[PDB]
Amino acid sequence: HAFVSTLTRGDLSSIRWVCSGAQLCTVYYASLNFRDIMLATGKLSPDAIPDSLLGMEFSGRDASGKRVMGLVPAKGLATSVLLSPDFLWDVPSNWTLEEAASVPVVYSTAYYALVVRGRVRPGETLLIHSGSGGVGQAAIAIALSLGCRVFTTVGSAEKRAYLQARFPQLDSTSFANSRDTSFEQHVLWHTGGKGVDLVLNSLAEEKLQASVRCLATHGRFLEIGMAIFLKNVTFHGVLLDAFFADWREVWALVQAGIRDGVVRPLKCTVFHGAQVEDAFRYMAQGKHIGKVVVQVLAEEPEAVL
Amino acid sequence: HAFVSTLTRGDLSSIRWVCSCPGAQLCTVYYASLNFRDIMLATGKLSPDAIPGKWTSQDSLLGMEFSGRDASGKRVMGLVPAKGLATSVLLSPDFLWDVPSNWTLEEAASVPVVYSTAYYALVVRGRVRPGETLLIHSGSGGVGQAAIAIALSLGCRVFTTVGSAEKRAYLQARFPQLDSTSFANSRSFEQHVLWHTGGKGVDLVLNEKLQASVRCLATHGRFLEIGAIFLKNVTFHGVLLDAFFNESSADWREVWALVQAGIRDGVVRPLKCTVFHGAQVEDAFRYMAQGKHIGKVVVQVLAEEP
Ligand SMILES: [Cl-]
Ligand SMILES: [Mg+2]
Ligand SMILES: [Mg+2]
Ligand code: NA
């Protein structure tokens, strides 16, 4: 057994492996999430987390050899994990373990935000900021699966092209800029001045204010961790890791989304286990689209082993 | 036809009576209530431009609430976007309710705003469920009282803050179901609520002591504001009834139906009223502005027949 640790407080360059009804699983792939970077740099305190707390997401095999993926409150960046079966899903036959490790966090977050909290209804109109981000992509897949009208902001033309390739249902009018507030005029015009029913937000300061102005009356503002009253707006603070009966709803939504073809893996950037430091450094640069994953163990050709 | 207008914005001494939807109904106003917005307008603290009913009236925006008779002579009560402080009103029937035979018109004028607001806030927005726990700030205020009635009708556990011992006694008389542990101070309520919920907090807060109130929320709690957040997965609802008044909608009729059912089921009870005759409308505004009452300030435009 080994786990990943920051040997020097706050220094990403010091990231190293250290040898040292619950289900015991062998980890094949462990993904990096934003929280991991915040923990490693000391920007987030371990006390804020509900030895090393790195890693909340993995794919691998259970003791029967079955391919699984899951969420853990901590210690996912390790060679094995022990977790509640309430936080495990079967990996579909059409997925690699590599890509299965990109799924649990972003789709659990997106289903919780859109369905459980936002109560999105078929045909409603959404603004999903930073659509090429992990949670944004998952939210777009879900919204489209419900026949919603989707608007999304992207940080570059390349990110737009990426979303166009991933989601053929998106047309040119689906896209606006995440790097300014021009998405406001865009969304107002294409909704006839009515605005959107839901905003999924990760932006700041002036872009946040512009997002509030984008809401229709009774609009819901989903934040992933005068007008407000005139428009009877609702604001949701959303933090997935707090879950570590509502959760079982999220689990069921993810599972159904997997079976129904809604849940699709992200594109991954893969690092061998010995390059875990590089993986963290890379993740922190934020120049990729999709998931950064660490290959702890290579997947075998066998389906069950 | 006459209506109340402040001839000079911000000067209550300038308050005077001034003589003057295709399926809209004309109603004779017998009683017109005063609401917070009226006082803010009359004292000049609120601009008419902030009011959506500014497009509904061409002169006075005073008065959103009345009881009286429709054209058939039936006793009705209702909401208007503006110009409720008048001898007659023209409004959509979607904003009228029949007055129950056991109510006076006088007290019927105290019902539409506070119960529409509380049903919209607790049920439509807050989605309150039977047995949930609420903290209702300023329970003797109009909306606070209505919210307490609704919560108790659903078998909810109620905590409320009050401004004085007299206001506590008032709530005790009105709501026999409230016990001693229901009350804390609006002027320490955090410690009270935490102790009596075993540190769990409340499911809903109806609400400037926000930091203390937010900390009162159970994880996944809802904060209802009449016009840690992440750790607790909190929801904040901005609530303004007045947005609905300009024209009916399917959204409005849901609230209308809740009030109607609440009336029929004995949940909706008139408030206690302080009545001013029409000729004393200035006194009514001045009184209202001091806020030394419990219940409703109501202007008698016309006495109900004996
Ligand atoms: Cl009070
Ligand atoms: Mg792929
Ligand atoms: Mg009475
Ligand atoms: Na992770």
Side-chain angles (χ1 to χ4, degrees), chain A residues 137-184 186-204 206-225 227-229 231-245:
Chain A
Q137 291 187 50
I140 293 170
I142 296 163
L144 292 172
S145 79
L146 298 170
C148 296
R149 176 162 53 160
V150 172
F151 296 102
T152 189
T153 60
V154 294
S156 71
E158 292 96 319
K159 285 169 177 191
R160 174 175 71 248
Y162 171 85
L163 288 177
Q164 290 170 299
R166 185 166 178 99
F167 301 114
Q169 286 174 98
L170 297 179
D171 55 55
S172 68
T173 67
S174 297
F175 301 100
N177 195 348
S178 69
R179 290 181 176 275
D180 58 43
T181 55
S182 68
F183 62 79
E184 180 183 353
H186 177 90
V187 166
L188 292 179
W189 177 243
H190 289 285
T191 61
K194 291 169 64 183
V196 305
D197 298 308
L198 301 96
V199 174
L200 179 65
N201 184 66
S202 54
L203 309 182
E206 80 287 353
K207 304 179 179 75
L208 192 153
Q209 294 169 319
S211 298
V212 175
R213 294 195 295 271
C214 278
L215 287 169
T217 52
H218 270 170
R220 296 91 87 177
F221 193 95
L222 316 171
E223 179 79 18
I224 302 309
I228 295 174
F229 297 96
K231 298 198 301 194
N232 274 293
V233 170
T234 306
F235 295 94
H236 296 257
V238 181
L239 190 70
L240 182 72
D241 61 18
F243 279 118
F244 291 137

Side-chain angles (χ1 to χ4, degrees), chain A residues 112 117 119 121 217-218 223-225 228-229 231-240 242-243, chain B residues 120 124-125 127 220-221 225-227 229-230 232-244 251:
Chain A
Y112 178 58
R117 296 291 294 282
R119 294 286 154 212
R121 297 292 181 253
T217 52
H218 270 170
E223 179 79 18
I224 302 309
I228 295 174
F229 297 96
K231 298 198 301 194
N232 274 293
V233 170
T234 306
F235 295 94
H236 296 257
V238 181
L239 190 70
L240 182 72
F243 279 118
Chain B
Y120 177 60
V124 178
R125 296 291 292 281
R127 297 176 58 82
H220 300 276
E225 180 73 14
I226 313 310
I229 300 302
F230 297 99
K232 298 196 170 171
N233 273 291
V234 171
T235 306
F236 176 96
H237 299 259
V239 181
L240 191 70
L241 188 71
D242 311 20
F244 280 120
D251 285 324

